[PDB]
Design a protein around this nucleic acid. Structure first.
Lengths: 52, 150
RNA sequence: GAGACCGAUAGCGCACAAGUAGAGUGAUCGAAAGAUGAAAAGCACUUUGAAAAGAGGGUUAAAUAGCACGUGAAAUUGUUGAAAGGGAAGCGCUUGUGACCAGACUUGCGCCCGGCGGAUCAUCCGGUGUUCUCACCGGUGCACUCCGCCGGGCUCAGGCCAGCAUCGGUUCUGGCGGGGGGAUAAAGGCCCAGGGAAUGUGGCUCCUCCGGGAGUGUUAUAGCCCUGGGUGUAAUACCCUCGCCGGGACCGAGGACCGCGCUCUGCAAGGAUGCUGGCGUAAUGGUCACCAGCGACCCGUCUUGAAACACGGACCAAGGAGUCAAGGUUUUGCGCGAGUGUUUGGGUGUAAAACCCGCACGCGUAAUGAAAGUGAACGUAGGUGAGAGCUUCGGCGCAUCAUCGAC
RNA sequence: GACUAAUCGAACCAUCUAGUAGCUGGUUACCGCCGAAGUUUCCCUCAGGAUAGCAGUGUCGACCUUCAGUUUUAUGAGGUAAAGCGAAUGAACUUUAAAUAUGUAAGAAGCCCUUGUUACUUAACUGAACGUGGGCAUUCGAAUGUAUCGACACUAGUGGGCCAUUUUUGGUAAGCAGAACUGGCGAUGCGGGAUGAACCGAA
RNA sequence: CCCACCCAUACCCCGCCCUCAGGGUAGAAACGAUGCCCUGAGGAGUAGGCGGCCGUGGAGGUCAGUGACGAAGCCUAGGGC
C-alpha cells in the first residue's frame, strides 16, 4: 500500500538484503589499501609528461 | 507528456449477451461459473457462443449431425449452441445424443423416435461438466443471403 | 357516438353580436378579443373634493378578488434600505471587511454500588406450531434469579480550532567521521649534494642636490632559480565513494488477523498515533455585496489555409426548424423453422380491443438460356494443407480459408 | 416604352403553389469514449468527376501466425574525401578507404540433394519450370522493442490548403517561381519572445 | 568564463475522479454477481462516430402516493445534493 525507500528505511533494506547489517558492521565501505612502499614514478614518464 | 505511437485497444468481442432472455441469463451465469472454476476449454467456448447473436449461431441440421457422427464419433455427445433443425432429405436418423440451445419439434420427435436423447445445455453442464466425450458442431455461417451479396 | 389530438400566440380565420369589425372602385382581403366571487353580498353611512376619486367604515373565507376584476413572471419604472464610482462596465483565481445563514453539539453505551416497582428468571409438566430441534402459550419462581426506574461512582466513545511528543511517506537544507585515486596529486617546510644567474645582497670603486645613483662581481652583514635525493605511503586541493548527526516544509490514502522481515518479552516490519489546551458558538465553515493583488477582446455566422472585411444582434416573454409514409439495405432482439406469414375475408365478442378459422396467395425450398428447352452424388457428398473442440492419445476434425477434382 | 386607380419593357385579384434555387441566413440539454484530412491513381478541361489514403461503431476468427518510418551484418548507389606512388600505373592513379542519409536481403512458411516430364529453353538431360521422394530439431540461425493481430459489415468528414528547414531545377535590375521529403497549423490550451497565425520551451 | 537564485498545466511523490486492461468471488454464513474486492496504465481536441444520463406534454401498470390542516404555478442577499 506504500512504497518505502530502502535507502531511508533500514528495515526495508534488511528485508531486501540481509548482508547490509554485516556490511555496516564490518565497514566494507572503509577498506584500507594493501600495505607496502609504493614505487616512484619512472623518470621517462615525467619527461614525456612535461615534454613540450 | 507521453509519446504513444501505439494505442491501447478496447475489447472487440462480446462480454455479455445482448438478449433479455432470463433463462439465457441463468445459463450464462452457470457457464461463467464453469469457465471460471474449470480448466476445460469447452466451457469457455460454450460461454462465448452463448454470448453470440443469431447470425453468429446458424442452425445445424440432423443430416449435418449424422455426417459428423461418422468415423468413431457415434457414441459422443453432440453439442450445438444453436437451433437443431430437421432435414426431410435424411430418411433414416441414426441414434444420437444431442445437447442444443433449442430443437425444432420435428427434430426432437425424430431424435426420440430413432431412440436418441435430447438435452438442454444445463443438462449438458450437469452430465458433462468438463465437456468430456463431446462433439462440438457449428452450422454454416456463410450460408446467408447477405453474405452471398457481400 | 368516440380519441395515448389541441388547451385561447394552440386548436378551424372564428371557444366571444366572426366571415363580424375594418380595408379595397372592384374581383376580393380579413382581425383582435375567454376566467370577480359559492352567492353581487358589485361598498350602507360619515367626511374631504367642482368632479373623477380619496379617507374612514364595512361585504366576503379572502378586496393580498373592486365590473382596470383567478393566478399575476420577465423586460421596464417608483419609493425605501445598503453600497460603488479620477475617460466603460461585466467576468476568473484568492484573501479581507460588512451583512446574512446551513450544519454540528446538548450526551450515549457498558461495568460496580444503594434505593424502589413488578414477577413474561433457570428447570420441569401439558398443549400447539415448526426449519423436527427449535420456539410460543398455561402452571412452577418466592426473590444471592430476571425486567424497568431513580440516585452516586468509574471506563470507553463523543462537536470546532489548535499546541507538543513519537513515527511513516516525499522533499529542501546545514554540519561531522572515514575510505579510494592521480606524478600513490602537483606544491610547500626542514635537511643533503651539485649547478647557475640577475630586476646583483654585503663588500669595493666613482659621482652627488648628501637624498641617492653608476660600475664590478655570485652570499658575504639579504636572497632567488634549476637538477637529484631524504623526511614521505607528509599535508592539502580536485574527483569518486561508505556512513553519522542536526534544522524546516507538505502529506496520513487504508481499516480485525493473515505477508516479507528485524535490533525478536518486542519493533520505525503490507499507509498516524499518543498527550494536552481553549471554545462549544456564528468561533470554524458557507452565501451575498464591495474593495484589493494578479488574470481576462463581443457573441455567432461566412470565407479561405487562416485573419481581416462583411452580415445579424435595443430589451423581455411566448413560440420556432432532420418529421411521416412507401420501398430497399446492414446490424440487434424475438417466434417458428424447410418452411413461414391469423387480421382480403369469415367466425366470435364484455364490440374499432381481445380470441378463433381456412382456401388461395406472397416470399423461400433450383438454376440456366434471347428463346425453344434442359435441369444438379464416381467417391462414408471427394482429395490435399491448415484449423477450435474432443480423443481410446492411434487419431476424429466444426466454422472458415487456400488449392485440385466431380455435377 | 409613355399612360391604363400612388401598381407597367406588360395592371390588379384569387388559384395551380408549401413552384424551383446548386446561392444567403438559421437550425434548441449535459457528461463520457475515440478522432481526421488537401495531385495516390485514373479518366477533355472549366460552370468536372470518381478513387486511394487517413476515422468511428459493431462483430467474428486459434486476437493463430509475429511484426517494425530503428540499428547491425552482407551487398548495391554515392569511389566522393582521404593515404601512398621508399605498391604498380598516371575526379579521371590505385593496395586500402570517407561523412549524410539511401535500395535489397537476413529461415523449418527455410535450405539443399535425388527422380522423372517439359508443351520453356539449351549444341545437349543442359539450365530453368512443374511434379516426386529424401536429408537437415543439437541450438530455428543478428540487435532492440513488441495492450502494435487478421478478416468482414455498416457509417462519416476530407480528398489541386497556408508557413518553414533541407535537397533539387530554373530565374530577376531586385524581388522570385516549380518539384521531393519532413515538421507545424487549419483542430490547440500552457511558460517565455513587452505585443501577435508561422519563433523558443513544452503539449 | 564562473557562482547562486526565480517559475510552466513540462518532470518526480501523494490524494481524489473517470476510462481502459488484467485477476478473485457458490456442495453459496448468499448477491441492486447489472454487485463487491485486488492490481496497473492512461486523461487536449474542430469536422465526424458512438455510449450513458437529465428534462417536457400524453398513455398502461404500480406507490393501499401527496392535497382545502392548502395541489399546481410564481418570488426568494435562505439552504442541501
Amino acid at each position: 500500500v506504500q512504497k518505502k525507500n530502502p535507502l531511508r528505511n533500514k528495515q526495508i533494506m534488511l528485508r531486501l538484503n540481509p548482508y547490509a547489517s554485516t556490511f555496516a558492521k564490518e565497514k566494507l565501505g572503509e577498506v584500507k589499501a594493501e600495505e607496502g612502499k609504493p614505487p616512484k614514478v619512472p623518470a621517462s614518464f615525467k619527461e614525456l609528461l612535461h615534454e613540450a | 507528456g507521453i509519446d504513444l505511437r501505439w494505442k491501447h485497444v478496447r475489447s472487440s468481442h462480446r462480454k455479455a449477451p445482448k438478449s433479455d432472455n432470463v433463462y439465457l441469463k441463468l445459463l450464462v451465469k452457470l457457464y461463467r461459473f464453469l469457465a471460471r472454476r474449470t480448466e476445460a476449454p469447452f466451457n469457455k467456448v460454450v460461454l462465448r457462443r452463448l454470448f453470440m447473436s443469431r447470425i453468429n449461431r446458424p442452425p445445424v441440421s440432423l443430416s449435418r449431425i449424422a455426417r459428423n457422427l461418422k468415423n468413431g464419433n457415434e457414441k459422443k455427445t453432440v453439442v450445438v449452441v444453436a437451433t437443431v433443425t430437421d432435414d426431410n432429405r435424411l430418411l433414416q436418423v441414426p441414434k444420437m445424443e444431442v445437447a442444443a440451445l433449442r430443437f425444432t419439434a420435428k427434430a426432437r420427435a425424430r431424435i426420440e423416435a430413432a431412440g436418441g436423447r435430447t438435452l438442454t445445455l444445463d443438462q449438458l453442464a450437469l452430465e458433462k461438466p468438463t465437456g468430456a466425450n463431446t462433439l462440438l458442431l457449428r452450422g454454416p455461417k456463410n450460408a446467408r443471403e447477405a453474405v452471398k451479396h457481400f
